[PDB]
RNA sequence: GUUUUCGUUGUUUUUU
């Protein structure tokens, strides 16, 4: 049975009558065994002169809301946004991508540290109730660690 | 309210191919049921040719109740409804 | 008849009344109480009485009899039981309706929130429909905040606030908003409460809640008892041969009943609250699964093996369920299916039937006085051979198994007995192939019992089937009654399906061997000798034993192909067609002239012997009939069999090759095209390629290279075709036309050419390359799918893979198109299944509402009209005058005295002059009528009845109208005859004035054409019809016209459906299947919104003013023309500190300093034909001066409009983004672009003829039909919107009908095929006969309110049944679908009447025929 | 050259259910760690080092789809991997691809 | 898979039309494309109970 | 500019309104049916182009031939709204004007919009019947389209014998909806049946009849 | 002893 090879970026053009524009997909799963562990699809919001800024909020595996990417970067260790660009921005000569990621910075600006970002993820993390902020952050960190890029680590 | 008068009949004065098939089948089935014969027979063992000969001279005791869309109908004797 | 005697009189169902079932009536039909889930009483047969498998409910085996009725399967009709639910439950298809009825009445008093007191509710209740009145009741209940205890004066209401009703799980919950908002007491709405409020409902209330008191009840809508089916319905079904697995229905009934008993146990035991809840919900979804296991959002009831459990809902909706798979489609007997083979020596209307088929299949012949001898011979002959009886049916019904009967031949036949006579030769049988698109796919062939196990057929009859003998399975059906045989012989025969009503043309023609032969035979230098002549004469069925004198006689008698042709041809057939403007001396033997069956000159071709209109087959159809065509098929087929058997014609490799000169012409043509391709590559790669209109630079490159390479392949192919030689069997093949064509030779010999997939070019599949053997951006042909070889040479691996691309493209196209073309066909058939022309002649529905008062506006069938040229319509007015006007006083333009015996009377007479005058101005009036109203621009040849031309020629050749003998017939005779016959034309009979008005409407064109042909002047000056000639001409015209009338009872709706669908079963502007689908789904706007604005004559001959109009129609915002935008916060409100606007604002300025800045494109301004200052002014109007605008100086480097606002960062960007799109600069909105389009519109000539005129026009993209129509310089009375929905919105329903018709007409003409006018005219009128646009969408057809038996049978049957039963509707069994799923005579054609045994004609019989 | 371009089923399954070509072989699965070592043999720059300014035009290196290093002199390493697969120390089936443009 | 048999191209019998071929009876009598077909029916005894 | 295009729009709308009347058997002064753009501008509009909807409002007599043919036909009061946004007060003022003058038929072609609240009173203008239209679709005569045939209301005898001859039912005719463009053109209310004379390709002329349903 | 007794679910592949 022929199946798509995993662990590859798959960016697709989402339908125009939809809040999503481009879906960066990767079936991030353990290379050895070639068995599915998880996957992730980052969806780009907004339009041109329509739909406000080009915000990016992706639904992590087993979370019940599209969480902004800058926020999960805060939750995953790099809370300052310049680190987020150092991870994203690699042709610094471009200004259009800077001004296009500005709305993402604006929306994730409500999150300014790893603790609030991890709690943000955990609230929507589809976990049980009464887990409280501590275990919520711990579970968000685990799900950012396990089942998120499991083929990486 | 049911029968359109023979003069009030505003439809074709000719028999129709559907009427042709119905009349032929009915007459040939009748004579196949040992019904009275309205024409002569030379070698037409199969009743269909006998019914065809009946239709040729139009010696057939049937009458067509052509239903009008409004609900009424026109009664046309075989011998008065012209051959077509 | 065959049934055992029953005193019950023979009757059929005339009406079907829907509605719910009361529990009281459920017991009234319940033959036994069912409470035991357990079925087999003691596991030793005799299942449990009172259980699910109660024998009292029915018997299941051969010997056992139903205890209720007394009979087994032989007569056991099935009997029903009842099982009392432990608690009332909900019906799966009524919970939405539970919410509906809970949104209308009181929760305690159980009555409507209003009455007929308010006008809205009263007028809602005046609606006859139950569902509509009840839904309007809802729509007015929602206008009231509370369940009114008084007027919004007590109405007997409870006054408690209506709860917010929600379908909460399986049951519903009502949020009572009791005494800003109280505690929301949403609760389980126990069915007891609903029963209470329903009982509180008054009969007037339920009536105004859309219900019938005597019938379907909201009380009945609550289930209190369930029905237990008869065991016949869910019998012991064999899981393994004898071992029966219990029926799924039995399983589910057991589950439901055990849950019910659990509920019954919930009371007497300790039930701590939630246990009752869980058991009740258990029982509830079990019952739901009884109706529907497919409850959404629920894991369905599933077998322990893992497969889900089914429900009744499933078996009623789908593709092959009850209705689809057992009622509208079900198996038949006396039917066989086997291989097909060719039989060139066989007649057309026969099929070579295997002895196995003709033996196993049989017809019951009743024993009569004439067939007694032969029937007895058949009975004694034996059941295991032919001919022979295998069963002999007694007149009472008894049967004898002849094979098992040891005295098989000892069955003495009684007059009235039936003998299953084995299918003989010449037995008419239905003939069926899958698929069967056109009605010509069902054909009645005569069985010819001949050996081999295939179906032997004629070649010609295979072409309409479009099938072959590569293993196709074909279907034969044997009639079982005399009615059926007569029907087959008179309404479904092979000869009766020769002519396609679709393109009003024959379906059949001479193909293959016979066609190539007849090409090789008719030629001038074909010579035959006495022996071969005499042999074919004996072969010719239509030879009179008399051979004519050979054309060649000395020094040796020799015969020609033409005489041999005429031998097979029975006389009385004349044809004449100039071909390519050939002369009378026909050096090339081209042209065409048959005289009375004898070919004068011209070689017969497939253009005449095929299915082409006006052809020889057309001619025999319209002169002699189908039998003569069948005869001529056999004649030509057998003589060709002889002649080719003796000559033979073949193909070889040397035939497929052309000399090396043309090979090199091919090579250099391809090379030159490659060089042109490289030039285009260079121009594109340096942008030197000029941009094509509506064709982008790279795509322009690709497309033009595609055109160039197609020109390469076609040039090479035409060279190869030119080098094809006379003995070359390849050009002989195409000229013969038995198969193949130009492009075929082009590909085989010269070069295949570019492999064009979906009208494209093979792209670079890899990274910037089509193969790793090619390079990046290899724009040259070899790397993009242009074939450089022919099929002779063989192809390089790369281009071989490209041809694989094209071939797989074609195969996938076919395979995909299958399914959609299929469902399209099925839905179209469903759409118009009952349109029939009644005996009145009007096209109506089953409701009687007239679609069209007449068939095709003329009441004619699609086999009696033919293309006829109305002579008046064309012709210079001077030429028209000197052809139509007479001149008696001056002999220069007079009738010559030789032709008439009364020229002296003619010379100087005035009565004759005034008569011919009146006729002349009559013709002039006809000229106006046609050239200005009916046929306006360029065409004068139209399908009209009665072949006048052939009638005139027939008169000439019968009465010897040659020579210049003087006329014994006077002009008044012609004139009186014409005036009489104009009235003699009868279409709509009756005496009312509208009857004769419709008569005139039907006969207008025919009278005008006859006048254009049969005017006295033409009569005398050309063919001088004598007494006999003229009288028989009039009589024959009248007879043919009266035979040209539509037969009432035709299924013209299904005829139209097939005649439109079959064309669609063969295949950038929206045409073909795309445009078809836009039409059929009734898309509100078509995929190509484009308005064909017709500029005024003076603008239509203008371009630049038309260009200005085009720009004024092309909507322009700054979004189109904004080159760039950079927002500043300008530090000073009245100036700036930036080089880009310093001088500009210094010049313009002579509030909020935040700056709304943007740049505009000067080139885009001038292409828009605007300037940036008017853009600033437009912003001045749209935003006042709140956003202080400027226009920066036009001489400045940057076209800047600073709309200064009057922390302000985010709002500035918001306004900037908004006004980049919401500043309308110029143009008509809704029109993104316009095209500058030619139209070769025909206009008559002042001298009298016609001529084309180039008139410019605007193809405005998008649809703003109203606005472009209001644009100055626009033909408001002609401008069209390609979305006919826009026409409905704008012009109405009549114009929308015309527009839809012309759309479909253009789509039909897109492939080049033709379809008859009247059928798709019926289509478009039905689309419009109800004043709006009706769709073939599922709900759109289901929104109808006829008998549900059709719309439910379409799809989602269960929902339609819920709606109908909730309305307790009535089916009058008037649809044909009701007839077929009840198995009785249909009210169509043969069933469009009631043929009756009479008394007035029976009295004429001799007295001996008296019944005893 | 990788599949047979003429072997296809009929309508419902046409195009689908595809066959190999004649000389094809399928990777049975080799440990990725030897490939990791072969790649890291050329002075791999970690993903942490990947910077917009420093690595403005450096080569991002991936294994089996997992991004596992950066480099600025990739010609030598790609040539060595190609020749080494020619040799056999790399499993002869292991795919080496060099996206020069990106 | 197949045999090398003799074919000529022409329209001699008129039966060759429409995916049909004309055959030499002599080759068939000699056994050209004669073949052997084999059909295996499998049957077995069953256990209704343990001894039944 | 805006002024002249508004003037021409209004003038053509009025022209086709008077075509409404003419096609409804209402006699009209042909000088007004020929009230060309310049004379309409002079009589109605001002120097810069400001129109006068109230002065332009006229009353139309029926043709006497229609009077014997369509019996009930009274007069037709064409009046375009004074205030573009037809308010409750403005609509009430116009309706009271209609009632006080007892205009047998009164057509109220508004300018900008008719809010549903102002449309509530329109059925309550008894005994006067009010018809409300827009200028835009009256700018160009919809029924003057070439493919559009001409349409005529059937009077009592006409429609009556139409139904009697076919032995049809009123619900058994082809339908023209009450809001059909030509139905609004032809002032069609319940039961009113229209003869349509369609071009016939196969017979020359075709008679058709649609019931306003 | 005239007469006289097999079936389905699911699965795959197929047939112009
Ligand atoms: Mg087939
Ligand atoms: Zn029974
Ligand atoms: Zn109450």
TrEMBL record, chain A:
Domain RNA polymerase Rpb2: 6-153
Task performed by this protein: DNA-dependent RNA polymerase catalyzes the transcription of DNA into RNA using the four ribonucleoside triphosphates as substrates.
Identification of the protein by name: DNA-directed RNA polymerase subunit beta
Similarity section: Belongs to the RNA polymerase beta chain family.
Quaternary state and interactors: Component of the RNA polymerase II (Pol II) complex consisting of 12 subunits.
Organism the protein comes from: Komagataella phaffii (strain GS115 / ATCC 20864) (Yeast)
Subcellular location: Nucleus
UniProtKB/TrEMBL annotation, chain B:
Gene Ontology BP, a term: tRNA transcription by RNA polymerase III
Recorded GO MF terms: DNA binding; DNA-directed RNA polymerase activity
Compartmental location: Nucleus
Record carries keyword Transcription: yes
Superkingdom of this protein's organism: Eukaryota
Keywords recorded for this protein, A-Z: DNA-directed RNA polymerase, Nucleus, Phosphoprotein, Transcription
Any one GO cellular component localisation term in the record: RNA polymerase II, core complex
Family from the record: Belongs to the archaeal Rpo6/eukaryotic RPB6 RNA polymerase subunit family.
Name of this chain's protein: DNA-directed RNA polymerases I, II, and III subunit RPABC2
Organism, as annotated: Komagataella phaffii (strain GS115 / ATCC 20864) (Yeast)
Residues of the full protein shown: 71 to 154 of 155
From TrEMBL, chain C:
MF-aspect GO terms: chromatin-protein adaptor activity; DNA binding; DNA-directed RNA polymerase activity; metal ion binding; RNA-directed RNA polymerase activity
Residues that bind Zn(2+) 6: 106, 147
Binding residues for Zn(2+) 4: 106, 109
One GO process term, biological-process aspect: transcription initiation at RNA polymerase II promoter
Positions with a binding annotation for Zn(2+) 5: 106, 109, 147, 158
Residues that coordinate or bind Zn(2+) 8: 106, 158
Name under which the protein is recorded: DNA-directed RNA polymerase subunit
Species: Komagataella phaffii (strain GS115 / ATCC 20864)
Whole sequence portion shown: 2 to 1463 of 1743
TrEMBL record, chain F:
Record flagged with keyword Nucleus: yes
GO biological process: termination of RNA polymerase I transcription; termination of RNA polymerase III transcription; transcription elongation by RNA polymerase I; transcription elongation by RNA polymerase II; transcription initiation at RNA polymerase I promoter; transcription initiation at RNA polymerase II promoter; transcription initiation at RNA polymerase III promoter; tRNA transcription by RNA polymerase III
Coiled-coil annotated spans: none
Residue stretches making up the RNA polymerase Rpb5 N-terminal domain: 6-97
Domain of life according to the entry: Eukaryota
Keyword annotations from UniProtKB, A to Z: Nucleus, Transcription
Principal subcellular localisation of the protein: nucleus
Gene Ontology cellular-component annotations: RNA polymerase I complex; RNA polymerase II, core complex; RNA polymerase III complex
Keyword Nucleus set for record: yes
Any GO MF annotation of the entry: DNA binding
Subcellular location: Nucleus
InterPro entries: Arch_Rpo5/euc_Rpb5, RNA_pol_Rpb5_N, RNA_pol_Rpb5_N_sf, RNA_pol_subH/Rpb5_C, RNA_pol_subH/Rpb5_CS, RPB5-like_sf
Domain RNA polymerase subunit H/Rpb5 C-terminal, first and last residues per copy: 140-212
Family: Belongs to the archaeal Rpo5/eukaryotic RPB5 RNA polymerase subunit family.
Database matches in PANTHER family: DNA-DIRECTED RNA POLYMERASES I, II, AND III SUBUNIT RPABC1
Name assigned to this protein: DNA-directed RNA polymerases I, II, and III subunit RPABC1
Organism listed in the record: Komagataella phaffii (strain GS115 / ATCC 20864)
